[PDB]
Design a protein around this nucleic acid. Structure first.
Ligand SMILES: [Mn+2]
Ligand SMILES: [Mn+2]
Ligand SMILES: [Mn+2]
Ligand SMILES: [Mn+2]
Ligand SMILES: [Mn+2]
Ligand SMILES: [Mn+2]
Ligand SMILES: [Mn+2]
Ligand code: NA
Length: 327
DNA sequence: CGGCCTACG
DNA sequence: CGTA
DNA sequence: GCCG
């Protein structure tokens, strides 16, 4: 009895099938690089099923009946069980296309379509991109300029220092506004690629215009290396370190308090968890979910939520705390 | 056959 | 397109 | 790739 949607089962951060799930996730990533979003989704889902299992898979028999395992995903597990290696996964790993697409798409500002164009033009290294600067957006220029720092794990000590300076700026911009850590750190991860914060105010409407004021105040303290009426800011901060500094990606999001549970849920992830929750909402309950609200399209009304628990309840789902959303 | 999350910058 |  |  393993439910078919990732939002229906707890997925902890530490699980028991990392070898198998990591192989399936290489095939998912490669499917994305080739423009096959459906295959990507199936391989992601199959990997996530293994993360939810209570014990290591030892025998092919233990896959029978599990959702999202068909011929292809089962063969990959079978080969890993019997041989320790899957020829398809290894061919992908070793391939110039996979390695370069991974290198390029890891850059802030570069997705699959851009990386693929560059690949087809013959580019292979970061220095190749640096050699043709006029072919870069400002966002990509910043991602490349800070690429080394942005590839360094963000630690909890960084999170805590960043939360302090964001809270200081937010408090200077709007008394009573609050700052909530979201993203992977709220799910219990000890490291990350960035830090995500959600900002609100308990009085509906007071948060109007807040994010530009927060950004100005951070910029005047020398904390901003890159930023773009707005409600989401995808920033690079100049984080002080002893005797120096490092660039860190920081996402700042403002939501009115009416939307705060929806934004908190949406920004806490995981990414697969949130896509699966929205799919469940629409396909199983007929309701439309995003980070703003939950809409009943037949009554034309929005569900009023005071908490994440309220949203799960309205969807008929057992509540999962953030640390069990690691699908 | 046809879907696969759903927004903002 | 990119970001989440 | 898997599934409704
Ligand atoms: Mn366990
Ligand atoms: Mn196949
Ligand atoms: Mn064999
Ligand atoms: Mn994050
Ligand atoms: Mn909005
Ligand atoms: Mn088809
Ligand atoms: Mn297909
Ligand atoms: Na990227």
């Amino acid at each position: 009895w393993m439910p078919a949607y990732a939002c229906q089962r707890p997925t902890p951060l530490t699980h028991h099938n990392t070898g198998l799930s990591e192989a399936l996730e290489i095939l998912a990533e490669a499917a994305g690089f080739e423009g096959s979003e459906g295959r990507l989704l199936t391989f992601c889902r199959a990997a996530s099923v293994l993360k939810a299992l209570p014990s290591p898979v030892t025998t092919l028999s233990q896959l029978q009946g599990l959702p999202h395992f068909g011929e292809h995903s089962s063969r990959v597990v079978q080969e890993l069980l019997e041989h320790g290696v899957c020829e398809e996964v290894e061919r992908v790993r070793r391939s110039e296309r996979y390695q370069t697409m991974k290198l390029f798409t890891q850059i802030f500002g570069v997705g699959v379509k851009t990386a693929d164009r560059w690949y087809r033009e013959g580019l292979r290294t970061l220095d190749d991109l640096r050699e043709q600067p006029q072919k870069l957006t400002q966002q990509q220029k910043a991602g490349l300029q800070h690429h080394q720092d942005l590839s360094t794990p963000v630690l909890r000590s960084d999170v805590d220092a960043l939360q302090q300076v964001v809270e200081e700026a937010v408090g200077q911009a709007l008394p009573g506004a609050t700052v909530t850590l979201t993203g992977g750190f709220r799910r219990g991860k000890l490291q990350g690629h960035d830090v995500d914060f959600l900002i609100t105010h308990p009085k509906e409407g007071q948060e109007a215009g807040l994010l530009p004021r927060v950004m100005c105040r951070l910029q005047d303290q020398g904390l901003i290396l890159y930023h773009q009426a707005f409600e989401r800011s995808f920033c690079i901060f100049r984080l002080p370190q002893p005797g120096s500094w490092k660039a860190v990606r920081v996402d700042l999001v403002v939501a009115p308090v009416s939307q705060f549970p929806f934004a908190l849920l949406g920004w806490t992830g995981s990414k697969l968890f949130q896509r699966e929750l929205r799919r469940f909402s629409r396909k199983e309950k007929g309701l439309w979910l995003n980070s703003h609200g939950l809409f009943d399209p037949e009554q034309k009304t929005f569900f009023q939520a005071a908490s994440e628990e309220d949203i799960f309840r309205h969807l008929g789902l057992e509540y999962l705390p953030p640390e069990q959303r690691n699908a």
